[PDB]
Structures are given as structure tokens and as C-alpha cells.
């Protein structure tokens, strides 16, 4: 199981995720613990936008790394 940092503005939030949860799960998981609704969360790791129907581990997001959150719409 993975444990990831999330960043916006000057904010952080921690979330738990199983390596092979989808990015959409990963989004819900943030949401459940920070407000920002799924359909508004645009997630950036390593120069890429994390796409919804991909495994979190497909992006090789290691434990303890930050994935950024740009709110959108």
C-alpha cells in the first residue's frame, strides 16, 4: 500500500492508496479527505497529467512522494 503527499497553493494532505487502485479511485480518496470534488481535481506527477483510467503505480509514484493538485473548471 502506497502513502502519498498531495499539494495545492500552500496546502498539503496525506492519502492512502493501494498501488493498483485507478487514478479515479485515487481522486475519490483525496476528495474523501480534503473537499475538492473528483471532477475538479487535475493531478500532476513527473511532468504528466495523471489520467483517470490508469493504475497509480503505472506512474511509478513511490511511497512518500508528492503528487500535485491543480483545481480546475
Amino acid at each position: 500500500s502506497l502513502n502519498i503527499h498531495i499539494k495545492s497553493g500552500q496546502d498539503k494532505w496525506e492519502v492512502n492508496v493501494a498501488p493498483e487502485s485507478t487514478v479515479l479511485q485515487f481522486k475519490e480518496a483525496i476528495n474523501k479527505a480534503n473537499g475538492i470534488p473528483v471532477a475538479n481535481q487535475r493531478l500532476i506527477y513527473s511532468g504528466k497529467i495523471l489520467k483517470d483510467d490508469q493504475t497509480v503505480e503505472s506512474y511509478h509514484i513511490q511511497d512518500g512522494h508528492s503528487v500535485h493538485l491543480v483545481k480546475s473548471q
Binding site: 500532476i44 506527477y45 513527473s46 511532468g47 504528466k48 497529467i49 508528492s66 500535485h68 491543480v70
Partner: protein
């Protein structure tokens, strides 16, 4: 003063923190978005 690295320091950092390492691209994107990270990001993600 009046010098891109100095002028867009805080933004360049955020972009680089997100994996956007290409300087010329970032400055280009940032000039167009007037400094907005939020906008440059969007630019960088489609050209």
C-alpha cells in the same frame, strides 16, 4: 530586473517541482500566461 530567472523564480520552481524541467518552454509558457502557473501548466500540457 528584468531577467526571466529572477522574474519567474517562484513559478519556475513550481513547474520544476512538477517535473517541467525545460527552461525555455517554461518561460515561453509563463510569458503567455502572464506569470500564472495555473495557465502555463495548461499550456505545457498541450504545447
Amino acid at each position: 530586473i528584468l531577467d526571466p530567472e529572477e522574474r519567474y523564480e517562484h513559478q519556475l520552481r513550481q513547474l520544476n517541482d512538477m517535473g517541467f524541467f525545460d527552461f525555455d518552454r517554461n518561460v515561453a509558457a509563463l510569458r503567455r500566461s502572464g506569470g500564472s502557473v495555473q495557465g502555463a501548466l495548461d499550456s505545457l500540457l498541450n504545447g
